[model samples]
Target: SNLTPEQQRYLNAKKYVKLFLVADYIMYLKYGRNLTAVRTRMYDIVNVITPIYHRMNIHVALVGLEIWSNTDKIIVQSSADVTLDLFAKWRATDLLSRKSHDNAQLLTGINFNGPTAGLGYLGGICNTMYSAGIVQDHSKIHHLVAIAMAHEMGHNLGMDHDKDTCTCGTRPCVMAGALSCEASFLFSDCSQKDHREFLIKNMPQCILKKPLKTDVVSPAVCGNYFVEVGEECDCGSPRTCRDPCCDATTCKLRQGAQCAEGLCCDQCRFKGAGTECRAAKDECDMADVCTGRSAECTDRFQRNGQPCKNNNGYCYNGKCPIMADQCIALFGPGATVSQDACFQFNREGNHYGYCRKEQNTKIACEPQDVKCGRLYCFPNSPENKNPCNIYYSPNDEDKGMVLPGTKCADRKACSNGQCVDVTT
Candidate 1:
């Protein structure tokens, strides 16, 4: 989008940020505050935004500074509203003055001597009616005061507290609230982006007519040890996880950190009485000492000792992960399309395990596999030949066909589309 000359000036041209420093009697006396100290502290505050505005050649000039005329070293109480109210009274007196007519862009920071609730002070209010529109509790830490000022000024530049750039993962930006006083003096990328946009929308005259020079630097980066820009913790570039057992790349503990208190371990060794580990029991490929018969354990169902339970089970390793196919008639690939449409097949694949299920074995069909007491052999429908019902099993596809007297509960399960009960 094209910008007006005003907006262009805010980004590419020069700009001045006017300021008013008003403090109570104690702050002036106790701190022995001077114009230079105030300027230095404020300069430290703008350091965050400087990297941004400086690039555009914009300059923040402190046009004015003064102590509040009231000798009252203390305020009974203060809030955002009170801060503005107090500034209004000061502005009415000659004690407050501006450098130019464009001083409408001024930020007035009011500091009270004693602590007040709600952080005790307000900073960076855009309502210019109160002369400079920012306030801070001078009684707080000096750095906190600086942070508050920068945060309020950020508001003036169109930055929001909860914007995405105002956060780093779970941590929020300095403008997000009365945030951590320990936070770094760096603005989130989001707020910076907004500041750029804010400048582009205004008229050229809103900024300083004369541009000034400033020391320029790059935007702060992550992993520098100091928390900044999208990083939560950085052990500095050179430091890393110290534990050898932990995966250094991800800073996580390694998989085998000694889980001794388990059902089983070292599958080959059977324990003596209470020492036996059960965790490896169901692992068909692993060694088992409980049964007296020594076995290679390779054959699943035919194993000499305890046979592999997975040979035939609802949810087995070889079966498609989805056990059920049809919905209990409760009515709910190519190879997995469906096992039994009327009722779910007796396995997980029937439920929904299509591609995930794979049957590794093959079975042959037996002759005399009659359908509904009728012979179903070749020279019939190209679909079925002289095959046993077992031939149709997932493991026996295209193999043996006939198995006489195999009772099918449902008629559709029979080769000729019929069913019966073996008990009868």
Candidate 2:
């Protein structure tokens, strides 16, 4: 079929980005450099373009920029060549910072190197290297040009890269500790916590400002201990159970630190309940009865029926140590990701656990199944003198109120509640 000249040009325009040698070809208006020449100049810069391929994305407007200065920080701006939208966001009165620049602000580039290869690479380096500009100032030609373009038009609102790196499970700012050196990709927990206090200050015609509400944490369980983050041991951060005396309480927590009466035993938090302790001033003495279930318990530490002579050597035998996971949701398997509660006992202990990672079994385990926090002990072994095995419940991940289960120290030997290591 025969096509008209205009029709062929129309088809070519739709097909290629170089739509027309049309009238307002602003890209070619400068210094008699033709459209093809201007484009060819940017030819070697193809690698610098980031992932966004669209022509008008706000980032597209962020390419070549001029540098400028202020009393304090550097700013960038749109020159006669570019008309990017670098307007200030939030309206006035959101006075997070005392100055207007902190809230609704304007910008331009902080620095520039030259006509960049493309928009993506320009954004990547500028957002990540604004500091390089501040560190060098408006002098170094390339640094100034690039920094000005990125900082002003793109970053003027406020924020730098390193301030962006975070462990929050999401990536945000390019300057942040994102997953890639490129601007297009990001990793979880790599974004910065929002530090921009750009909201305006509004003094009503009648009242002062309202303050943000205080945050309250919910209770949690970690075996027999349940304590809140940032809470003191006196209130039982996780495991604050009443003692036998009716007057005292001992809250088991991630720190293994113990609290009896009102006094704080900081050391108790580290020497996890699994560590045997026969008797050094009775650290777990909330009930004054040493738990016969700890590795720390020696033969002499035996109290009542709970004896330390047996190798089972723990109060809560088979009791899932720190049943924190049992209380957590069970992620069946590969199809789901599991998140266990955190157990930070003072300065030392902190870790993540999955509900299924440590399942309780009657098969009985050796010392390797050690769960930190909370002691295992023979809570029922008074007077009769027989050790009642009680270890932190590895089941029901929660921390308060004890759960009972039995461990079979022998594999071949089975039965209810007791082991038969007949191999002997």
Candidate 3:
């Protein structure tokens, strides 16, 4: 079997991913600048991939679509790598504050200067800095573009290119390094294994929460599992719906059913007030209790800039990113954050160590910013040690860089490669 018993059980649980899409001016021109045609094509692409993801019990919803009709938002260049970097930066600095999404993807009509058709950061979902991709819309058939988008998204979800052992019957799988017509629509067992592992480990908060009604861009569809307008409850299609409190065909609550879903609901009824609905996951998280009214659990978190880790760090985004924990996740259980002396390498300002990259140049880390730059870790054993060893992909060198929210110094944390006082 492709999945272990534990993995199989995990797959039985469903996940929903919200995607935001963008079309560059070149792509708009390809549709002859007809807004209706471009919108229709976007919907068509989503329709093509929805059922494919649904097979894995992941419901993908289109939350927003932006068409750069007049001009490109950022330079829509021929180099796929450059375009992807620009898109990620734009999404972090501009797009995210305006709209919320699990991930964003850009589709362009310009063929990439290189052989690559699409590019994405591996294991980047829900990360503000890396959760984006760029795809060259190379084919007239929308299905082909949709396939390419899906492949790139697989990378964002932590699935690497499938190996020789991975197969979908006699055909190649979707994660194959070079996609073929037969492999266009199916994810291999290897991809499934990787996705399952990522979810088990990361538990990305954005995708886990049910998207708010105002955030959904597409028209309401009853069987899509999201409870939307005109529906008392929605548990998905009849074949997949498992909630006894909901009537799948009509998307309504069963007689005497007060609630059909959410952490605050128990056996079709709301939990009593003060009952714990969400427990604190870490030092930076806050527990939430039932109000005895709403079916949904209120999300609460430690205030940003609040002291944590014995006042050595400050909370950000419900995470207190200790260097030791980050190192362990990257290397292994016994691995630990290297001594401060190791971070001195950041002064070199090269691939091995740097604060950040600016277009083609690497920015050297200042003395105060040393800890905010590249991360150095001591592995569990000498045989397993390889400093800054790439864990995601060769193209993703930023994997070795210190995560943005990490505590860098006393009363300070890293933010865009600078140590800033959290107290401010």
Candidate 4:
């Protein structure tokens, strides 16, 4: 379902938004916590970036993991609860030699990995991990932060960095290794089209009520916990796009139109862009203290052609609705996914499972991450749990599995109306 007005803004959609600003214990001692400006920047950044995800069927949820100084690690969770391990060793530079991480200008520099800024375009670091956009915040214009954050968010949505000169809004996306500026934002109509395609592919669900305005900013921190809106169970039908003049479902094959939410462009899905489904006021709460989104059950908006939500957000069956008990049951309270698990899950799917099937439903069963961590040292990595890796979830006994089912990535099976472990 579409987010509320307040929530919408939080994810960078409309205006009303929910903001979360968790500080890295280490950062607190360093930066003085004047996040007002930075927080605002993140808002604008995420706002510009979310539309990319919404259009791409990409899952771009955030995480609030703790940060550590003097560390060379940066990891980003997947748009669908997937984890990414990034190593900053390659970015290590003598830029500001002889400076302790705490008081160093690391956060403002381009060398990232530990806990710098999410959208730093300084140069040496990786901004694709946290920010939905990234840029060379020379002036820290705040909007620059938004730009950088949107850039990174673009990556999460399956797009890449720009290299074309920010010109004609072409395709190949900013994610592609272009080394130019042309790919910035949803440049090409195809870029937005692909984005909406992927986003709607994994929407959590729809609410008949209305999409709220959401909050005002991205949570300062939102790692370790999440809304299970991007797992296997979360994968419902192929998503359609929704934007200025696009709809994914009924208009995918048009001259140059893309599918959005559940409609195609050229007004085939609704009376107008952002017009098909009415906003539903479904209140989703923050499951974890770091999450800025809500957790209440949301209703759905219907359409004569396809039952969809506002802004053309397709119904997602993979949203997290408080699954502490479920996660625990599958892997034990200390359940954790492993490197082997990641490979197996995404590649094959094992460990736990989801309900086999359901009728007219858009609810997925998933869990919050233990902590937004980097798999830099995955099994094939050079460190922790190294040499081999796969999506993993471990239990107290150190027991865990890949994803949760050779077939079911996140839902449980309902045989005879009873939940069963249908994990292959």
What number of clashing residue pairs does each candidate have, in the order they appear?
A: 36, 89, 0, 153
Per-residue error for 1 in candidate 4, Å, reads 27
Q: lDDT (0-100) at residue 276 of candidate 3? A: 96
- Ranking of predictions according to TM-score: 3, 1, 4, 2
Candidate 3 per-residue lDDT over residues 1-424, each given as its tens digit: 3656655555555677789999989888999989888888888887777767876667778889999999888998888889999999999989989988889999888999856789999999999999998888878788877888888888998899989888766767768887456555888999999987887777666765666677777666677666776788887789988989999999999998889988999999999999999899788899999999978898889987888878757898887777878888887788878878888888889766888887868898999999888788887686864554323346666877788777898778888778887765
| Candidate with best TM-score | 3
lDDT of all predictions, in order shown? Answer: 0.37, 0.25, 0.82, 0.30
Tell me which of candidates 2 and 4 scores higher on TM-score.
4
TM-score of each: 0.37, 0.17, 0.62, 0.30
**What is the model-wide C-alpha lDDT for candidate 1?**
0.37
In lDDT terms, how accurate is model 3? 0.82
Model 1, 1-424: lDDT tens digits are 8766645545554465544444444444444556455445444544434443343344444444444334542342345556545545445343433333222221234434344212222222233343244445443465565556556556655666655435544545556655564655566767667666665554335455432212112223332222223332223233453433334333332464321111332222222333422224353333323221221122222122222233211212222111112111112211111223212112222221111113532211122222222112222235643221211234323222212222233211222212333223
lDDT of 2 at 209: 17
- Residue 209's lDDT within candidate 4 is 18
| Candidate 2, residue 395: how far the Cα is off, in Å | 76
Model 2 — TM-score against the truth?
A: 0.17
Tell me the deviation in Å of residue 322 in model 1: 85
